[PDB]
Amino acid sequence: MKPYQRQFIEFALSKQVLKFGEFTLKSGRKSPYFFNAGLFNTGRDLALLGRFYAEALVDSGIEFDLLFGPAYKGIPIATTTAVALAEHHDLDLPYCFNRKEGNLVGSALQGRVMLVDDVITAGTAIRESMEIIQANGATLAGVLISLDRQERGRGEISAIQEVERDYNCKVISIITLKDLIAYLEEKPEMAEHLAAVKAYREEFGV
Amino acid sequence: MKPYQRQFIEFALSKQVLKFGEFTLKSGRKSPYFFNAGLFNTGRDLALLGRFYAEALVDSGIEFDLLFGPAYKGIPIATTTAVALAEHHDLDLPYCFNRKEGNLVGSALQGRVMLVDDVITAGTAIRESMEIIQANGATLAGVLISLDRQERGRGEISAIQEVERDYNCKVISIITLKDLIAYLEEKPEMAEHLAAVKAYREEFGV
Ligand SMILES: O=C(O)c1cc(=O)[nH]c(=O)[nH]1
Ligand SMILES: O=C(O)c1cc(=O)[nH]c(=O)[nH]1
């Protein structure tokens, strides 16, 4: 993995965003780990989070014209990501927010849009944003997320793959489950957690 | 005025946020100028806006423990201000957002709270935030805004003074009408606008 990906994992662990134990997902599936972006709850957390989103976005090389934050959780994520693109990459991006869970604010909604999210569990929320995007003449180019859990969704493919197929876009993640596994292999002291996650990948992974 | 205040005025003018002409305020009053924070609509705009809020906040010396962003417009403003405090002042502040125009997200709502706004036209929205703040055991210490227009509100005193009296808090602005007048006096080329604003201050100013 790239340096910034290792740094993001260490950041998420240090802020208790990424935790191991016995968690029940929205699916009802039981997971040995959980990524809770709600716990990025200070201004330094927001600053670093935006910088990691922006680095993932620049590293991907995907072309986009506008950064879209859908209410409610997308608005702060898009805000700090837009700030980080300007401050750390000298990129001045139009943004648009939907004050709707359309009431649009920000720049004219036009062009290739990058939607920001944290963790994808279903495609429904993305379709609502896609319809507002398309209703204003723009196009959904990609979805930017923190973590791709790389596990089956409702059908045979992963939730991220369902989004890419259904809405004909690219998904860009800061990290994936594969990266989390590679991180844990570097750390002798959490060998036990590494075994629990690898066990989880074999049963539910894609 | 301080350097950052002159820089904020030049920034607002360059991004068409601050405009002169014939505007009708929410009051129905006619003003030779209008400050439209909606036009801070790119990521660089958001980055600089957060930096100017943070500088105003640090310059004021007011003590606060948490930065509160009330939905909808307060959330991006609080986000970029919190980021700027961390990135440019090495201050890591808890934040809380109200996803309500209470559904609170962010850090535990506790302590001395600084609410963020853009332009105060009435105290009603601030009271709703104050009640959520007080309902969670915290206290409203201040309101941080872009521009204090320094004109009468509904009674004898200004809208900002009504907020300070009614909710027993301090209001911190990046700039005031007085600063705008001082800026225009430096600029021979807009002598005509300077006369129109001074005329407006004498009729409506506090
Ligand atoms: O599947 C989920 O509901 C889920 C998993 C996870 O790691 N994080 C999250 O926010 N939701
Ligand atoms: O009085 C208002 O409604 C008002 C004035 C101004 O300059 N900006 C704004 O957003 N509202």
Residue to mutate, B17, B19, B24, B25, ligand 2, most ligand atoms under 8 Å from C-beta: B25
Query: What are B8's two structure tokens?
Result: 């904020």
DSSP A24-59: E-TTS-EEEEEE-GGG--BHHHHHHHHHHHHHHHHH
Distance of CA B136 to the CA centre of its chain: 24
Query: What are B160's two structure tokens?
Result: 């900002």
B95 CB neighbours in chain A (<8 A) are 41-43, 46
A112-125: b or e for each residue (b if 16 or more CB lie within 10 Å)? bbbbbbbbbeebeb
Indicate left, alpha or beta for B168 from its phi (over 0: left) and psi (-120 to 50: alpha).
left
Query: What are A14's two structure tokens?
Result: 């240090």
Residue B157 CA, ligand 1 centroid: distance in Å: 51
DSSP A72-120: TTHHHHHHHHHHHHHHHH----BEEEE-----EEES---SEEEEE-S--
Q: Does any ligand 1 atom lie closer than 6 A to the CB of residue A26?
A: yes
Length, in residues, of chain A: 206
Burial of A38 (0-12, 13-18, 19+ CB in 10 A): exposed
Residue B152 C-alpha, separation from nearest chain A C-alpha, in angstroms: 29
Cα separation, A180 vs B164, in Å, equals 50
Give the three-state DSSP class for B43. helix
The CA dihedral of A92, A98, A103, A105, to the nearest 10 degrees, is -20
Query: Which residues, numbered 39 to 68 in chain B, qualify as contacts with chain A under a Cβ-Cβ cut-off of 8 Å?
Result: 41-44, 46-47, 50, 67
Domains belonging to chain B, first-starting first, are: 1-206 (3.40.50.2020)
Contact A46 B99 (CB under 8 A): no
Query: What are B149's two structure tokens?
Result: 């227009």
In sequence order, which residues have a C-beta less than 8 Å from that of residue A192 and are 6 or more positions away?
none
Cα separation, B93 vs A45, in Å, equals 9
Query: What are B204's two structure tokens?
Result: 């409506």
In sequence order, which residues have a C-beta less than 8 Å from that of residue B146 and are 6 or more positions away?
B8, B35, B37, B49, B52, B53, B118, B119, B173, B174, B175
DSSP A148: E
Q: Report whether B74 contacts B116 (CB < 8 A).
A: yes
Contact A82 B107 (CB under 8 A): no
Burial of B63 (0-12, 13-18, 19+ CB in 10 A): exposed
Cα separation, A193 vs B197, in Å, equals 67
β-bridge mates for residue A94, sequence order: B42
Cα separation, A100 vs B195, in Å, equals 43
Give the three-state DSSP class for B153. coil
Cα separation, A187 vs A194, in Å, equals 9
Residue B25's nearest CA partner among B132, B151, B136 is B151
Give the three-state DSSP class for B206. coil
Give the three-state DSSP class for B53. helix
Question: Which ligand has the nearest atom to the CA of A30?
Answer: 1
> Which amino acid would we find at residue B81?
T
Residue A201's nearest CA partner among A172, A170, A180 is A180
User: How many alpha carbons fall within 13 Å on the CB side of residue A120?
Assistant: 32
Residue A41 CA, ligand 1 centroid: distance in Å: 17
**A88 in B contact zone (CB under 8 Å):** no
Interface probe with A: pick from B36, B39, B44, most Cβ of A within 10 Å: B44
Contact B75 A80 (CB under 8 A): no
Task: Please name the method used to determine this structure.
Answer: X-ray
Query: What are B95's two structure tokens?
Result: 């934040």
Residue A13's nearest CA partner among A43, A54, A45 is A45
Residue B146's nearest CA partner among B61, B37, B72, B4 is B37
DSSP helix, strand, coil percent of chain B (3-state; round to 5): 45, 25, 30
Query: What are B58's two structure tokens?
Result: 């640090």
Cα separation, A82 vs A148, in Å, equals 21
Cα separation, A88 vs B9, in Å, equals 24
Q: Report whether B171 contacts B142 (CB < 8 A).
A: yes
Query: What are A88's two structure tokens?
Result: 């750390």
